[PDB]
Design a protein around this ligand. Structure first.
Ligand SMILES: *[C@@H]1O[C@H](CO)[C@@H](O)[C@H](O)[C@H]1NC(C)=O
Ligand SMILES: [Ca+2]
Lengths: 48, 96
């Protein structure tokens, strides 16, 4: 079916934003957003 | 900042200095706090009380005191050797 262009293109483009606001912190520190998107990295792994 | 100007412009103080020591403070912001704590303790007279408590994952007293000191000349010298050996890693919480 055609709609795999429609879905999974937005799957990547959401996932790169998931790596955009990933804010690195030097000596093992997490703010809140890095805590959340680690669990959201499970969502992107779930799809593929 | 001179002894005679401070007593005549304040009252005694039960003061308590908390130093955030997570991962977010290694580098430039470490050397400043090591400096700025060491400059804060000189504005004390000898009615003022202090105690230095880093907060981290848990909150502890890196001082060997666990309560308030009298802040002599002497007890201010103890804390500065405590301040100048603080590591920096972990997670901020502000609630513990
Ligand atoms: C930190 O340095 C002070 C002063 O030399 C010393 O009393 C203390 O034991 C040191 N702590 C560690 C973990 O090296
Ligand atoms: Ca922090």
């Amino acid at each position: 079916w055609k709609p795999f262009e429609t879905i999974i293109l937005l799957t990547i483009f959401a996932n790169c934003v998931a790596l955009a606001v990933y804010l690195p912190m030097p000596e093992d520190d997490n703010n809140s957003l890095n805590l959340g998107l680690e669990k959201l990295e499970y969502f992107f792994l779930t799809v593929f | 900042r001179r002894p005679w100007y401070i007593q005549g412009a304040a009252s005694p103080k039960d003061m308590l200095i908390l130093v955030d020591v997570s991962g977010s403070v290694s580098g430039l912001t470490l050397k400043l706090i090591r400096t700025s704590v060491s400059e804060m303790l000189e504005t004390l007279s000898d009615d003022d009380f202090v105690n230095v408590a880093s907060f981290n994952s848990n909150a502890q007293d890196v001082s060997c005191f666990q309560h308030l000191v009298q802040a002599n000349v002497r007890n201010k010298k103890v804390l500065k050797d405590a301040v100048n050996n603080i590591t920096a890693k972990g997670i901020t919480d502000y609630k513990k």
